[PDB]
Symmetry: D2
Subunit: 177 residues, 4 copies
């Protein structure tokens, strides 16, 4: 207890609607960006996970991709067909299968990056006011706090991984390494 | 411009991962709560929209339900089959079809409410630390600001609608009106 | 431990400068507003404390006025001279002396209120951007959290007291009850 | 307009009380830390400003010290008497007088640093809960936003100056360079 029941219902509905809105917008923009290259959302997500972690287990891919293991194997295979990634020999347990990007896939990823225009995506524009007032893009700490308690600190290490990987691996003259 | 390209990529990835995590958790908890009653997530969402707005157009239902019109008609029909809601006579345009809850549906909704246990749902527990430190549940303003610029102030009026409807229509001794 | 020493120094300096800036600005604006009526900052603060709490002990006045007891007695006396407030008979302990506003003082307070122009005060203008982005004036929760741990929940009840007193006791056509 | 008058009064009182509380606590802790060395708050503030800016004008000192010019000259002189700082030859305009720390003063500053214990100061402890929940000390952005609109971006550059100076100039084994 030490909270009202009402309060709980209000908060629940509030976040469920907010989170549905946000996921749906990001989903739509993202799908726009990547549909030229015939990639599902999951597939691009998987490709990035491989870039950032220097290859991964399916169980890694499903953890950081917030998908089920099944989907991670299925879409991983679909990508193998497209020559984007490679598979390890052991298929004992789908979970332990190890994935690693082919070179063609890495070029796909870099290309998609040069195709990137922020000003086309909704959520970016929705956040620009806040960037202007604060001088920096919104941190949305409360959200991160929540997802940490939900998903775990090792989960949460992907944010640090990707920050460092973007900063170090690439540089910009018009947008790419 | 007046921001870095890098910055944009960091922010994009950050929010896309955060928002996927949040939507997936709420999705899983919600599905747990409502699966006894053989209801899709969309279907429950539609039923609430009808309760709050005293019936609605399909186009209303899709706006506030963040779904496509097609889905809103399809799942609305599935609910009509279940005797939960009623349909208007005009089917000229799916969009203008007017939906209104049957009594059986309203009982379903109230029942689901008495079935509600917050302590079972992840995101609730993830937010309790913040509730303790602040003395109130997290407001997540930055998120709301964003969704407002994205979706519109009339969209955003559902939060006020539902706050007032919960407060006024119901009272709690163990949880329900 | 479980923090860096450096971190501690950074945070300390940061807040000490921020808090000096804020106090000095509010001090200057406030002094501008009240200098017509020949009132020190403390004296006006004391008068409000009496209005809100329906009279008070000196020890109350010093708690909520964040001043020393000595100052609270001295400036309280200066106000008695001005016919603004009245004193209880017991002077056994300065702390237990009970203060209550004269009518003249209450008129002074209401007058000062009609003299109030927000647009003249700095800190108000500094906060208007945030009010525009958020649709509401900044909550500055982190600050309140801090002051709560510092000063105590009974201290913190003055915010609720004054919110309710402003809302209920007064109404606005051009600014006053 | 486009806000209520009431709202303005609420916000004003709220921040004025919060800011008085915070300044008074920091004032008391700070005075505790520095009273061994017979230093006013202003005097220590002035000494730090000189360290960070490699000497300064009085007008600089008053800007960043949020004091009047008069006080900045007076307390600067008192420090010259103590052999802490040195003066430029020109006294044409007090404002343009240039101050620079003597070596004795720098040792005083470093000493005070080794005397530093965070766990003694109130505001530090008031913020530790937030540090624990967030994993980092509170940013209090809203406050900084406000002070920026109030005081100016060049004013605000002292935060960056001191961050970099602390990080680079010193290192810690038990607390000092």
């Amino acid at each position: 207890q030490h909270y009202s029941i009402k309060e709980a219902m209000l908060f629940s509905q509030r976040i469920a609607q907010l989170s549905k809105a946000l996921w749906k917008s990001i989903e739509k923009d993202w799908q726009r960006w990547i549909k030229p290259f015939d990639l599902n959302i999951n597939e691009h997500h998987i490709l990035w996970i491989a870039y950032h972690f220097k290859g991964a287990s399916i169980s890694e891919i499903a953890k950081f991709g917030v998908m089920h293991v099944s989907t991670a194997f299925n879409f991983s295979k679909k990508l193998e067909e497209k020559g984007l990634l490679s598979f390890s020999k052991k298929q004992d347990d789908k979970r332990n299968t190890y994935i690693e990007l082919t070179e063609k896939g890495e070029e796909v990823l870099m290309k998609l990056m040069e195709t990137y225009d922020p000003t086309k995506n909704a959520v970016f524009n929705g956040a620009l006011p806040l960037r202007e007032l604060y001088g920096k893009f919104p941190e949305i700490l409360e959200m991160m706090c929540i997802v940490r308690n939900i998903y775990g600190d090792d989960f949460m290490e992907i944010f640090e991984r990707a920050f460092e990987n973007i900063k170090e691996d690439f540089i910009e003259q018009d947008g790419k390494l």
